Automatic annotation (TrEMBL), chains A, B, C, D, E:
Cell compartments where the protein resides: Membrane
Membrane topology: Multi-pass membrane protein
Protein name stated in the entry: Uncharacterized protein
GO biological process: regulation of photosynthesis, light reaction
GO molecular function: voltage-gated chloride channel activity
Organism: Malus domestica (Apple)
Lineage: Eukaryota, Viridiplantae, Streptophyta, Embryophyta, Tracheophyta
Single GO cellular component term: membrane
Keyword terms of this UniProt record: Ion transport, Membrane, Transmembrane, Transmembrane helix, Transport
Parent-protein start and end of this portion: 78 to 418 of 433
Signal peptide: none
Length: 341, 341, 341, 341, 341
């Protein structure tokens, strides 16, 4: 009760920040087109990024660490002022230091921070490339199935097989994104009895891969054609592997706890070394330093698991859009080439 | 009317800058040859880059942010001068600070700026490599079709198939470049009825891939030869995938808004920390700092979507030039090897 | 006895640190799920990393080098104080220097330290990717064996072959991790006579690869199917090769001894150059500098051989979990596709 | 005449520098062997690099920009001296400034310069790897042709085909190097009528690829063997693609004009900020700064198109040397294996 | 005689350093096991690297450049002392300067040095990966030959073919390492008449590749199996290509002479700029700066050609060890799988 009520009050802003950041990660994202790129590289982008700072998910996550160090600066400033006004006994010293130790270690701090954020950006690029390969693989496999499968007796199996290659990116998205309804997202993509088996499996992408591999065995193909055709599933297994490792295995905790601890120690004694040249300007100085330096580390932490920063619904809808345009256009391209003669 | 007329006047230079930069991105680009490389690595390149600065697209895009911070410096300088001349009441302080907080965070700013521009350059290299692979793939596929297809009954289909492999890089260019007339750029490359189906499809590169895949099924080939031959389409699907992701998915907005916000905050208080050592020299100092530092970020923003910085018309014309030289030379190489005996 | 007892006392803290770090490398690690990622990117992560510092394996390994340089600072401070109080003869000078040589070489030290840790992180990413490829390869091979092998006469051999593809990641983990009981970890995965041959071989992963390759020769397959099927073993040979080279071949000893020697020389004379601006504050300054800078190098040394920082038991159990879900679901997917007709 | 004669005199040193650098790019280069590596890592390498500075191609290209900024420093110094001696009217001020703006932007300049040179080095490594792949591909293709082709009726065609695989790296070198006589370099490698068709083609590497592909169609091979054999031409198409893109597409002109303009602005006002601490030492200081900083950018510009920095004649002669050693040794290896029995 | 005897005395320490470094590159290296990794990441590694500094090959190579700059500092200090004591005429000035030009260029020097050493480390990683691929390729090829070749009539040829795949890594090691006895290292690996042909060839790795390719043509295999089997030689051609290019083509001499010349100019005038703050402490300051900064460049120069820093004998013996364990275990795995039934 006496000390428990103090911790509960201090546990309000960080709880609000955690709720705000996590709700901001469920936001729907969209593929950039040309007119959105024009808006991106505009003269007003510097004004509009500054005025949208208070609604930014990254800025609102800095509120706990920036407030924490600003009160540390205010307490150091208050104590140093009390010593300067002789309001405390002579035994109490003035908390001041030379900036020279910090001038020797500043480049070490900057290189650690920016390299940690570069490691996070590398894992985002790995995610983006893996999804590029899965979507190009599904497009390539669907294109080849539309051309390869010809027999009138395999029409139902060909239709089923084209439904699973569209459904695989959706299942993989529902595997990598938290709180995703695969049943709703596959309702119009798989058959009612088709989807029941998929919903009953622990590994939904793997299960759909299994339906793909068994359809290729029941098709009436020459063995060379089937071997060529079942070589395209390895793309899906590779995609599952890369996507599961970015979720399972983060950047080593030693490497990221180093950046965390360095930044916390640097802002704890930053008002002490800055006292001689700044006096009460250590409060705004520590506020701006903590906001700037913790923002780099915050950006690194948010993109370290990158699948929520990708337009995976639009990437998945692109494969579905491509197979319809193709099955509609088949009639026309077939009549056009018949005419060449 | 009273405040609306002020915003309209302030919305003139950024509108002019946005119009100038966007018109400069439609410029026709050309592949470097040897004598253009000699001009590139000349002693006069430092003079000619400086004298062509006022016509540079990047420099004219810096005019809004550089003017904005130069008037901030002029207002801070005017206020500090009024305090120094005792033209304001004693309550009004002098806006001055120590440079020591900025000396600790300078390397963090420099590393963030230069790493952001390096991320943009990485996406340009990804674009350039993808186009390298698509053009080498189209050259390789065309070379193999000229050698593989022999039957006199497949001459029309072979000619048609060589027309689509030339047309695929042009369709992909017209997919990635804004305001591109595919109908005009494919007028002499595809047949009149051939192009109508392509113009009616939502995915023109995909449609041409579909015409390629169906021609390979109607060719009278051995199945091993056809499987070898239809393995070269995967290059085109990979090219489409990489090109669509560089347009759809930019560098995460957190990562680039960080660099934007850092630079805006750094130049807002830069005249305050520089006042003690510079006085009215904060105006030229802030002008040069804003011009130098915003130019790095501007270069990063312009090459982030890189397909307008590539000579995609010359890369596409190279594939067309190669297939003619080949179909002309076929007669000669065939007679030369017949003679070996 | 007189000097041997002094070395034994000085050999206590480093022995304790070496025991603590090595016991901390046998810790069981777990794949991150979604709610563990939420905990990772929390507002409290800066507080909880600081309060868990005294139990951190990296921090307890810094105790020997941080104590060593803190007593060096205390001895330099004591000597300089004795000179300032004229307690020593006039011949004895004051150990002071200018910081200007250190201000010119600080960025060289920071770039060396952070690049060494980046080299270590690159070897961790190489390890993580190699295990990604091995697990995706085993999943892909198992999926294809479940579909490819059909003959009722090859049921026993198919079951045996699926047991070795699950067992290969476990043997490779027991090859790369020290003090690993392969006999206990393969007790329920291979047959009793199957495991005796594996336990008698010097290269257990290689031996299991050999059982896989011989099963593929005894299967009643068409030669094209078998060639397609025995192309998936190359993944396992590549995995063995990459995993053995990260253990056998460290980062060149020149490159890492450079960072070691630089840091030792920099902290030996750091209290001498800092004396004029700090006086007795060289003790806390050297303590914090040694703790910060040796922590970067320590993080680099711990992840340089990275296989203990990976959840290799969970990655291995995922392949076993996937093949059961598959052999259970086979009955259902077969009845579902039979029904398409 | 009055102003034209001044520009002609100022256009002498840059013309001489451009002539010297361009003649130095036609120099014959040689593959390092072991005793040249011993000379490379010698104790005297620091003395011999300094004494060979005046004959260095990079140093003689710095003469125009280093002289230009040294006279700027001399003019600023002369003007500041005239003000200090009161030789000009009181209205004329002293051109001095604080170094603090330059101390905040120094790391930005250094990171831009060194990253630009790293981009140039990346394009050199891309060139070197592409030539590695082409030479290994030609060696691999020649080795397989010597083993695969057996029929006594295909001896003439086999000899012809081995002549084109040796000739392809020479044609690609003559495609990428300026002023290269392909007729002289292929005189002893192709037949007299063979070379006439190659000389008449606009794309000589492509033409030789076409002679290779047509020889493989006229060989009496099984179709599986021919498909295996014509899969090795893709290496040559990839080599042509990568080599043409490094010549056609430089590093984006925005990115390199940034480094150019930054360096020119930094050395223009460098004597003004250095006046208070240096006085006439701004002339040697600006001379050394311009020589050091423009040398980094110069190195970047010279290796940006890297094919003249490679020993392409020695790499091409290695493939020719390997096929002779092989066709000579064939008799011996055939008799050795016949004897195994 | 008068000036020749002075150069001979100055040519003693660099000759001794060159002899010591070159003898230290022939040292036998060993693959790290687990207990050597424990020794690597110990608390005593900072003490044991410092006490083994005088026997370090890199440190003894710094003796010529560190002594050279320390006498430069001593001469500058002696001259400045003579001026301060008025022992020279008034015309002779005091060699002093401001450190501000060096404070602006320090980060440029540090980034150049550390990036040059990173380029050297990249070439070491390329070498290490190439050897990883060659050893995994030889293991994979040997494993497949043991399974694929079955005919009792091909036992002698199968034994011969397994002897050449073990011998290829040894020949490639004897190709890349200077002063290597291939005759002694292949004495127990090839037949007496087998080795005579290999010793008579100019390209020993190529010759062994030729014996491998001819054995595959004389084996009684199905053509699909042989094509699968002769696809594994491309690994050996790739290995030869990458290994020959790292020896033939160093890092461009412009790029490394830049770092050399920068470091020599920086330490020549370093005692002049440090005189005002250090006086005779420029001698130890220049000694430590030259030792630290030239050590980074020295590490870069020693690993630039990396094949002596690899345990190539242990990597080669691992392939030989693996094929014996396999040919011994064949009997057992064959009886085990026969029993499954």
């Amino acid at each position: 009760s006496p000390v428990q009520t103090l911790i509960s009050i201090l546990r309000i802003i960080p709880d609000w920040s955690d709720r705000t950041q996590e709700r901001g990660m469920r936001q729907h994202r969209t593929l950039y087109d040309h007119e959105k790129w024009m808006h991106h590289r505009s003269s007003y982008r510097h004004l509009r990024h500054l005025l949208s700072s208070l609604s930014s998910r990254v800025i609102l996550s800095l509120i706990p660490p920036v407030i924490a160090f600003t009160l540390v600066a205010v307490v150091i400033a208050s104590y140093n002022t009390a010593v300067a006004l002789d309001l405390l006994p002579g035994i109490f010293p003035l908390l001041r230091s030379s900036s020279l130790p910090y001038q020797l270690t500043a480049p070490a701090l900057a290189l650690l921070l920016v390299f940690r954020t570069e490691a996070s950006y590398s894992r985002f690029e790995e995610g983006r490339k893996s999804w590029t390969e899965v979507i190009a693989g599904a497009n390539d496999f669907a294109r080849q199935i539309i051309s390869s499968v010809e027999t009138s007796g395999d029409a139902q199996l060909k239709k089923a097989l084209l439904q699973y290659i569209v459904a695989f990116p959706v299942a993989l998205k529902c595997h990598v994104i938290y709180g995703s309804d695969i049943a709703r997202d596959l309702q119009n993509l798989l058959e009612v009895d088709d989807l029941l088996v998929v919903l009953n499996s622990k590994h939904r992408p793997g299960c759909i891969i299994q339906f793909i591999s068994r359809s290729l065995q029941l098709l009436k193909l020459e063995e060379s054609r089937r071997i060529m055709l079942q070589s395209k599933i390895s793309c899906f297994h590779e995609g599952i592997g890369i996507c599961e490792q970015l979720i399972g295995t983060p950047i080593p905790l030693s490497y990221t706890r180093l950046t965390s601890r360095f930044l916390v120690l640097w802002h704890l004694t930053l008002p002490i070394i800055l006292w001689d040249d700044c006096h009460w300007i250590v409060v705004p100085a520590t506020f701006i330093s903590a906001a700037s330096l913790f923002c780099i580390e915050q950006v690194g932490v948010l993109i370290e698991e990158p699948f929520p920063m990708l337009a995976l619904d639009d990437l998945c809808n692109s494969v579905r859009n491509n197979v319809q345009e193709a099955l509609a256009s088949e009639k026309l391209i077939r009549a056009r080439l018949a005419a060449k003669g």
